[PDB]
């Protein structure tokens, strides 16, 4: 088995299932799904962080925002709900009246996700499972239901993997002052031994009740509890060698790193497994202020996925359900778009490896990404070239054979110097959906 | 803002208001104010500590004393209240039937205090505010009132500063064995992680509910919680840059040090800000056994204040209210005496700085202290010289002009060698109250 | 006495002399002074750290830059001294043949400086005193003289305070790899126990041999050695209470913070003592490529010191001598011009204290800086207004008597709304040198 | 870049070259090589550690054994070289007079090895390069040559990867007492800060001078020095990303684990990269007492590498040269015979990946090992079956096309229940050398 120590734990590497999966669905859903409001400011890495927390665009940050008097959220709250209306009161409004866990899993499977990961407890501390350590949970308040357990049964019956998300680093149930600046995160935390034990008993409890395939932590782990993870990790891996943990614990071990919006995004091959995450929009929690203006489009979603996958990453796309349990139409439609693209092109994505390089481009600026599957080399164009002549630069091949993916029709090419030249018969170019895809066998 | 680390926190120095204030009132008041008894043994630093805890003179130490069987307090307790009468039972007798927070603040303002600091929780653990972490408090038991909050409103409306005192180091609600010797203090403490969290949540709670101008800790801070103060201090200073903390935390940071009775008393200029504290008597908590025999006299109080102020210190004089909320007459009278002296001489005290030296003396043994205010040099005699000729030794001046303070009447003087000689016309000497005061302008 | 522990060293605050000194001279002089060359790229806070170490503008980093093959420095070194000319070999050309310490102290005295601080060992590890802990020092090689010692006697003869600079964080005598990006500094350090002892002993020796007025460390203190500093600070302070240390050690204690070029400048009053430091030009070490285009002007220097001084700081101006011990005239002439404005306006600068605010400006944008001296408030215009009606935006006065500093001639003024209006007669405005200075006495 | 901290170094995984190399040659050569003698007791994992150090079979432990008076080694030393012949004196007889590095690299190349790792300093502390940190090295004494350096050029000339072995945990130059029982290793170590610095500097120097492909430490890293490794690993990886480190340092990071003789052998697939290591005979250093009785046979070596390789490992085979630089023929002939089986079957070994399982066996017990190469699955019988009907217990195939590896001749096969049956024609079975190899393509 694994021993409770970093050297021993190193022995555990990211399981094959996670590496080969490529696409998963995040689900930020909770009492913050009720007010369902946030000022759609922009993308992390582009919105200046000295204003960021005051015009927070992440609707799940509502309580933090409500705690900063006179901030869009505060005014919005008083006008819609009134002053005498505490945030925790939303736990009782959080009823999931129309939630159908199996409809959800059906949806994610059509969409092409191979795993799903719901928030089991976000920064506000509300727990979506019947935990035995707090009464602020979905069984006692709102839904009157074990949201986490019921969803795991569904996802697993649909044959997808199930992981859990937990805010180890922050819990507003243990603080008062809101975060106004990045620097605040350094001292405005539970900070107590009591909180460290709590966090521990809670992740241990999710492991014992659901044995998730992934432990997805957020915001670091209570400094007083970091040494606990040696035991927790050994405990978890000895009951499920194929489980996995991300890199937001702040300790020596992780199975795969993470990148969020612009933040930590690799430009070329990293050399370790990682996962990119972002909302279909700018917020993770449902934001009734967002319109298509702020959401990506099926095509941008497909481009996001290829770019991520060509770089050894997995894309963990967030969906933001409504308080009643339904997934807003603007997001259900996009998941479907992606789902379809994956039905046609999935074999150039699932189960692939990175190639010598991730990227290239045509003489005329269309970007290209590559992926590998043994001797097969998928060439994925981020769009569809109009001309039949395609000149890819700074690229030479030693294959001899280059087929047009969806049809398998052998194509002619030749290395014209520093470039590679292929002729794609418009009959074939019109056959492709959002990306021209060529397969090359060396 | 301030970062949660000792290097960063160093950036914070004692605020000007505390430095310039010079005089403040401590208030040790609680259920121990009910039995209101202690054997008046003497002054800390003079009573041998191998007997000290057995004949404890600090009435607030009653529970500790009651826990040492057959000790004056134990016999006194059984005879007055009986064996079957636990100390905690005094929480219910602690009724403050005649407390008027505003009368108190009026009193302290007449007295000349520029700030006030009540015990919010002493060694016995009873809390004088409606804390949400223990039911042993003034809201649930005794007074049925938030003693701390109500007093803060008063003091602040009287225009004085408000700080809080808290026994971080000791809490008899978490121990059983009493302290019999100094050495016991090294292991007879709560000692638990639970206690450390508790102390933390409680000071954090006073900060959030009242934002005190001073955090006055006592008896050190729970070893398991010392690292918490980085966050607590940064948290506190970022909400109130003008707050301040004393030196009884046992960590790298403090704004001003403290000296208690004989213990740690500086003999000449220290070079850092500090504050002296002591009771009008020998005990801090009300002791119905003390008589004028054991209390200082308005004159000794004035001398204590000048000596302290000439050495860069602030004097924090303790008042010991009665269980019903009234301040015993022997103490109200002395506060008033001091108050008056300050109305006449206050300008040679408030807002001053130390001079090249703090002290001197006449040929005939009257001690002298100095204080500064720009080029003005206050010369304060600890008494009133009978003769018109005054020979101050080991002192020469380069001023040229030396006025008699309360009148401003220019006086003649000359440096007669190693000494300084001034002639104070008896008309002027009789005009002064407890101290002859000369002003010199160089 | 001071004890070897942070709580105790907290007691020591910035000595009065330092706070009142206002202006010191840094001297970066070493064997790097001989090639005396850098590509003059810019101001720290302005050049991208992405190419910084490659196009380094700080001539004292010659060795680092020379270790980066294909760097402008590497290019220059090979054509000028040859590929087989080791940096270390400069210690044999570093002969200080025309060096006259009394001449430097006199120049720094005439320039208006109150303390002088020379590099005793910069990053290259060459020591400008006969340390017994290495033979790569100015006694065994180059000058065959104790530069620190000799200049220490001269500065003191000239009546100025003498401090010492020491590269504790970097010593290239213990590394081989050059620094290429900021990240590198995290791991390209000496790292050994050996080196932590070397730094300790070397500063201890500087303290025993010359008991400096200031211990100015750079680049941090070796992690394995940080605790030694409790002992070193206590040792130093107990031998010399009035000494001081800067903030570049990476431990809880320091007396005054520092700010370099654009990096860390206070926008307004800070609350602690600090010191701005910069070259007269961009480099600290002599750079033959810098011409007047790259240097500040007497005007700009004065404006600098006034700004820095009105915000509570000290200005540590850097001079960079030539390999032969001579001070380049461009630098000597700027130091002299500053000296003149100070002989003339010293009183509005030395021994001053910040006022309620540091800053203000005229209707037509002339900037204005303030300083205090008891009741006397100096008003310094960064330059001399042409008109006679002068309008100061956002500033009333409760003084009644505004005089013209250099003549003492009373002037007419009144509060015109949120503004202050004063009439300075052009005969007076023509007398002022670089700055119109008004003196008010509220 | 990599940063000096475990979370960051986690990023670095075993380089592809190492994983694909499959076979390397260890070289234990030093001044112990001159007495070249040990009592040949057995295999680690077989000899009782109760007498192990007393009857030591590892000739490179000569000094330790010689310090145990009344040990077979002590006996032999006195009769052979005399009581007054200090171990250290062997450095003068260690002359490598017939040493030809290109000759070794060529032999290791012909033997089929892809990397070579020599002992740069074993437990006796003698260094086989001109380290500047001790005079007990091969430049000042014995060979008067830089053995590490010279062999490093040859191995690379021969096109092989070169790593370095370093005894970080033990250095007998810092102890006097010998090791007598396993327990002793817990306290008979250098122990000093001094030594932790020595090890750091020495490996740093090996990294600067030869940037090895592998840092293979032995016996742990000095406790006082364990943290230096964050800095050393980052430094090494940043200079050479494709380098690697083994698991004998006692800190969180490592790229591949090790297994020695019986100690730690994986029974089946492990999940991480590892490397088995052993002598061709029992000793690592040359032992004149070992004859063929104590060595493995070409047959056994091949069987070893196949087993080790099918379980995901690499086999690090040890060669032990003579004091004069010559490789004993018994060892040279085994290396050559292995080389031949590899020239012939390399393809089923190099660049391979574990299959679903490593193992299987025939009805009549012939063991069978598997390896993968994309879809191609190599089946290796440890030996050549006599019959033609071959029955493989517990193994179905879903391939359809099983060919005979050395001829490519298609063969007949079908699934007979929980078994697989194949018919290998004796003309083919007669062509195979030590192992019948079948290649399947499902």
User: Under the phi-then-psi rule, with left for phi > 0, alpha for psi from -120 to 50, and beta for the rest, what region is D264?
Assistant: left
Query: Is residue D376 within 8 angstroms of chain C, CB to CB?
Result: no
With beta carbons less than 8 A apart as the criterion, state whether A437 and A381 touch: yes
Nearest Cα residue in chain B from A187: B231
Query: Is residue C273 within 8 angstroms of chain B, CB to CB?
Result: no
Judging contacts by C-beta atoms under 8 Å, the chain C residues touching residue B247 are 7
Per-window interface: A 206-265 vs D, CB < 8 A: 241, 247, 250-254, 257
> Which pairing describes strands D115-121 and D164-167: parallel, antiparallel, or unpaired?
parallel
The domain limits of chain A are 1-350, 351-442
- Interface test with chain D among C53, C179, C193, C200, by most D beta carbons within 10 Å: C193
Judging contacts by C-beta atoms under 8 Å, the chain B residues touching residue C13 are 13, 271-272
Q: Kindly tell me the sign of the dihedral angle through the C-alpha atoms of A165, A166, A167, A172.
A: positive
Tell me the count of A-B CB pairs closer than 8 A: 33
Q: Taking the CA atoms of chain B, what radius of gyration do you get in angstroms?
A: 23
> Which pairing describes strands D359-362 and D367-373: parallel, antiparallel, or unpaired?
antiparallel
What's the CA gap between C302 and C296, in Å, rounded? 10
Contact call for C187 and D228, based on CB within 8 A: no
Structure tokens at B438: 């000369």
**In this complex, which of C6, C241, C271 lies closest to B252 when CB atoms are compared?**
C6
CA of D224 to nearest chain A CA: how many angstroms apart? 18
Q: In this complex, which chains have at least 3 CB pairs below 8 Å with chain B?
A: A, C
Judging contacts by C-beta atoms under 8 Å, the chain A residues touching residue B235 are 177, 187-188
- Chain position carrying tokens 């000149």: A391
Query: Is residue C187 within 8 angstroms of chain D, CB to CB?
Result: yes
Compute how many other C-beta atoms are within 10 angstroms of the C-beta atom of residue C283.
27
Per-window interface: A 140-179 vs B, CB < 8 A: 176-177
Q: How remote is the C-alpha of A164 from its chain's centroid?
A: 12
What's the CA gap between A54 and A75, in Å, rounded? 12
Phi, psi of D25 (to 5 degrees): -120, 125
Under DSSP, the state recorded for B278 is E
Contact call for A6 and D252, based on CB within 8 A: yes
> What residues have CB less than 8 Å from D220, skipping those under 6 apart?
D168, D169, D248, D249, D250
Structure tokens at D207: 């990294």
What's the CA gap between B9 and B6, in Å, rounded? 5
Nearest Cα residue in chain B from C252: B7
**In this complex, which of A11, A254, A374 lies closest to D272 when CB atoms are compared?**
A11
Q: How many residues does chain D have?
A: 442
What's the CA gap between B167 and B119, in Å, rounded? 8
Judging contacts by C-beta atoms under 8 Å, the chain B residues touching residue C272 are 10-13
What's the CA gap between B201 and C232, in Å, rounded? 37
For residue D242, which of D18, D6, D10, D8 has the smallest C-alpha distance?
Answer: D18
Question: After which residues does chain C break, using C–N > 2.5 Å?
Answer: none
Q: Kindly tell me the sign of the dihedral angle through the C-alpha atoms of B210, B216, B220, B223.
A: positive
For residue A1, which of A231, A229, A241 has the smallest C-alpha distance?
Answer: A241
Compute how many other C-beta atoms are within 10 angstroms of the C-beta atom of residue B240.
14
Q: How far is CA A354 from CA A254, B201, C21, in A?
A: 21, 51, 64
**In this complex, which of D196, D224, D234 lies closest to C187 when CB atoms are compared?**
D234
Which helix (H) or strand (E) segment is D302 a member of? helix D298-310
Strand partners, D368: D360, D381
Structure tokens at C164: 């010492």
User: Under the phi-then-psi rule, with left for phi > 0, alpha for psi from -120 to 50, and beta for the rest, what region is A159?
Assistant: left
Q: In this complex, which chains have at least 3 CB pairs below 8 Å with chain D?
A: A, C
**In this complex, which of A12, A241, A252 lies closest to D6 when CB atoms are compared?**
A252
Judging contacts by C-beta atoms under 8 Å, the chain A residues touching residue B231 are 187, 189, 191
Q: How far is CA B253 from CA B233, B250, B256, B312, C409, in A?
A: 9, 8, 9, 19, 49
Please provide the CATH number assigned to the domain covering A351-442: 2.60.40.1180
- Chain position carrying tokens 């949540």: B201
For residue B197, which of B231, B240, B165, B172 has the smallest C-alpha distance?
Answer: B231
- Decide: residue B383, CB within 10 A, 0-12 exposed, 13-18 middle, 19+ buried: middle
- Interface test with chain D among C49, C187, C189, by most D beta carbons within 10 Å: C187
**In this complex, which of D197, D208, D230 lies closest to C192 when CB atoms are compared?**
D197
> What residues have CB less than 8 Å from B55, skipping those under 6 apart?
B39, B41, B47, B71, B72
- Decide: residue A261, CB within 10 A, 0-12 exposed, 13-18 middle, 19+ buried: middle
Q: DSSP of B294-317, one letter per residue? A: GS--HHHHHHHHHHHHHTTEEEEE
Query: Is residue B271 within 8 angstroms of chain C, CB to CB?
Result: yes
Q: Kindly tell me the sign of the dihedral angle through the C-alpha atoms of C135, C136, C137, C142.
A: positive
Q: SS3 string of chain C?
A: CCCCCHHHHHCCCCCHHHHHHCEEEEECCCHHHCCCCCCCCCCCCCCCCCCCCCCCCCHHHHHHHHCCCCCHHHHHHHHHHCCCCCHHHHHHCCCCCCCCHHHHHHHHHHCCCCEEEEEEECCCCCECCCCCCCCCECCCCCCCCCHHHHHHHHHHHCCCEECEEEECCCCHHHCCCCCCCHHHHHCCCCCCHHHHHHHHHHHHHHHHHHCCCEEEEECCCCHHHCCHHHHHHHHHHHHCCCCEECCCCCCCCCCCEEEECCECCCCCCCCCCEEEEEECCCCCCCCCCCCHHHCCCHHHHHHHHHHHHHCCCEEEEEECCCCCCCCCHHHHHHHHHHHHHHHHHHHHHCCCECCCCCEEEECCCCEEEEEEECCEEEEEECCCCCCCEEEEECCCCCCCCEEECCCCCECEEEEECCEEEEECCHHHHCCCCCCCEEEEEC
What's the CA gap between D384 and B369, in Å, rounded? 108
Judging contacts by C-beta atoms under 8 Å, the chain C residues touching residue B241 are 271
Q: In this complex, which chains have at least 3 CB pairs below 8 Å with chain A?
A: B, D
Under DSSP, the state recorded for D410 is B
Report the top-level CATH class of A1-350.
alpha beta
With beta carbons less than 8 A apart as the criterion, state whether D346 and D307 touch: no
Judging contacts by C-beta atoms under 8 Å, the chain B residues touching residue A176 are 208
What's the CA gap between D295 and C97, in Å, rounded? 73
Q: How remote is the C-alpha of B239 from its chain's centroid?
A: 25
What's the CA gap between D90 and D34, in Å, rounded? 7
Using a threshold of 3 CB pairs under 8 A, tell whether chains D and A touch: yes
Contact call for B201 and A192, based on CB within 8 A: yes
Question: A337-350 burial by CB neighbour count: b if 16+ within 10 A, else e?
Answer: bbbbbbebbebbbb
Q: How remote is the C-alpha of C305 from its chain's centroid?
A: 11
SS3 D154: helix
For this entry, resolution in Å reads 2.8
CA of A250 to nearest chain D CA: how many angstroms apart? 8
Structure tokens at A324: 């009643």
Query: Is residue A398 within 8 angstroms of chain B, CB to CB?
Result: no
Structure tokens at A263: 């933040």
**Helices and strands (H, E) in chain A, number of each type:** 12, 17
With beta carbons less than 8 A apart as the criterion, state whether C24 and C116 touch: yes
For residue C320, which of C35, C10, C3 has the smallest C-alpha distance?
Answer: C35
**In this complex, which of D7, D12, D250 lies closest to A252 when CB atoms are compared?**
D7
For residue A180, which of A81, A64, A293, A281 has the smallest C-alpha distance?
Answer: A64
Strand partners, B216: B165
CA of B373 to nearest chain C CA: how many angstroms apart? 9
Strand partners, C379: C370, C438
Which helix (H) or strand (E) segment is A390 a member of? strand A389-392
SS3 B434: coil
Query: Is residue C75 within 8 angstroms of chain D, CB to CB?
Result: no
What's the CA gap between B295 and B335, in Å, rounded? 12
- Decide: residue A279, CB within 10 A, 0-12 exposed, 13-18 middle, 19+ buried: buried
What's the CA gap between A171 and B237, in Å, rounded? 22
Phi, psi of D378 (to 5 degrees): -80, 130
Using CA atoms of C314, C320, C326, C329 in order, give the dihedral in degrees to the nearest 10.
-80
Compute how many other C-beta atoms are within 10 angstroms of the C-beta atom of residue A417.
9
Alpha helix segments (H runs only) across A86-242 = 101-111, 147-157, 193-210, 228-239
- Interface test with chain C among D132, D191, D231, D239, by most C beta carbons within 10 Å: D231
Structure tokens at D259: 């297994």
With beta carbons less than 8 A apart as the criterion, state whether B425 and B386 touch: no
Structure tokens at A321: 């359900």
Contact call for B252 and C12, based on CB within 8 A: no
Q: How far is CA B428 from CA B302, B389, B435, D83, in A?
A: 20, 13, 12, 104
With beta carbons less than 8 A apart as the criterion, state whether D30 and D142 touch: no
What's the CA gap between D201 and B376, in Å, rounded? 64
- Interface test with chain B among A192, A195, A224, A228, by most B beta carbons within 10 Å: A192
Strand partners, B379: B370, B438
Judging contacts by C-beta atoms under 8 Å, the chain B residues touching residue A227 are none
What's the CA gap between C342 and C110, in Å, rounded? 9
With beta carbons less than 8 A apart as the criterion, state whether B404 and B438 touch: yes
> Which pairing describes strands D437-441 and D402-404: parallel, antiparallel, or unpaired?
antiparallel
CA of A174 to nearest chain B CA: how many angstroms apart? 10
Contact call for D254 and A7, based on CB within 8 A: yes
Q: How remote is the C-alpha of A86 from its chain's centroid?
A: 30
Strand order in the sheet with D359-362: D402-404, D437-441, D376-381, D367-373, D359-362, D389-393, D419-423, D412-416
Using a threshold of 3 CB pairs under 8 A, tell whether chains A and C touch: no
User: Under the phi-then-psi rule, with left for phi > 0, alpha for psi from -120 to 50, and beta for the rest, what region is D146?
Assistant: beta
With beta carbons less than 8 A apart as the criterion, state whether D314 and D24 touch: yes
Structure tokens at D343: 């020239």
With beta carbons less than 8 A apart as the criterion, state whether D199 and D222 touch: yes
Contact call for C177 and D234, based on CB within 8 A: no
For residue C24, which of C305, C355, C403 has the smallest C-alpha distance?
Answer: C305
Structure tokens at A304: 């996001």
Phi, psi of D439 (to 5 degrees): -120, 120
Under DSSP, the state recorded for A179 is P
For residue C232, which of C196, C259, C192 has the smallest C-alpha distance?
Answer: C196
């Amino acid at each position: 088995r694994y021993k409770p120590d970093w050297e021993s734990l190193r022995e555990h590497t990211v399981p094959k299932w996670f590496d080969k999966a490529k696409f998963g669905i995040f689900i930020h859903w909770g009492i913050y799904s009720v007010p369902g409001w946030a000022t759609p400011t922009g993308e992390l890495g582009k919105v200046p962080m000295d204003a960021w927390f005051f015009q927070n665009p992440y609707a799940e940050w509502y309580e933090n925002s409500l705690r900063i008097k006179e901030s869009p959220t505060w005014e919005y709250h008083v006008k819609t709900y009134g002053e005498n209306f505490e945030y925790e009161k939303f736990a009782d409004l959080f009823t999931a009246e129309k939630w159908d866990p199996q409809e959800w899993a059906d949806l994610f499977k059509k969409a092409g996700a191979k795993y799903v990961i719901p928030t089991t407890k976000h920064h506000d501390g509300f727990c979506l499972w019947g935990t035995k350590y707090t009464d602020f949970n979905s069984v006692k308040r709102g839904p009157k239901r074990d949201l986490v357990g019921d969803l795991a049964k569904a996802v697993r019956e649909a044959g997808l993997r199930f992981g859990v998300y937990y805010s180890g680093g922050l819990d507003w149930r243990f603080t008062t002052e809101p975060i106004r600046y990045p620097e605040d995160l350094s001292y405005i935390r539970p900070n107590t031994y009591e909180y460290a034990d709590y966090a521990y008993k809670q992740v241990m409890e999710l492991v014992d009740l659901y044995l998730p395939d992934v432990l997805w932590n957020d915001m670091g782990w209570p400094e007083k509890g970091k040494e606990d993870l040696k035991y927790l990790f050994a405990y978890y891996y000895n009951k499920h060698p194929e489980g996995s943990v991300n890199d937001r614990w702040g300790v020596p071990h992780w199975d795969f790193k993470t990148a969020e919006y612009h933040v930590n995004y690799p430009g070329d091959l990293p050399g370790y497994k990682w996962e990119f995450t972002r909302g279909i929009g700018l917020s993770f929690g449902y934001n009734r202020n967002e319109g298509p203006e702020h959401m990506l489009s099926v095509e941008q979603l497909v481009y996001t996925l290829v770019d991520v996958v060509s770089k050894g990453g997995n894309l963990l796309l967030n969906v933001g359900p409504k308080g009643d349990g339904t997934i807003p139409d603007l997001q259900k439609e996009r998941l479907l778009g992606l789902g379809e693209w994956l039905r046609k092109y999935g074999d150039a994505i699932y189960g692939t490896s990175v190639w010598e390089r991730c990227c290239a481009k045509t003489e005329d600026g269309t970007e290209i990404r590559f992926t590998r599957k043994c001797n097969r080399i998928f060439v994925i164009f981020l769009g569809i070239p109009t001309g039949e002549k395609i000149v890819i630069e700074d690229l030479n091949l030693s294959a001899g054979t280059v087929r047009h993916f969806l049809t398998g029709e052998r194509l002619s090419f030749k290395n014209v110097g520093k470039n590679l030249e292929i002729t794609v018969p418009k009959k074939l170019l019109e056959t492709d959906s959002i990306t021209l895809v060529l397969e090359a066998v060396e």
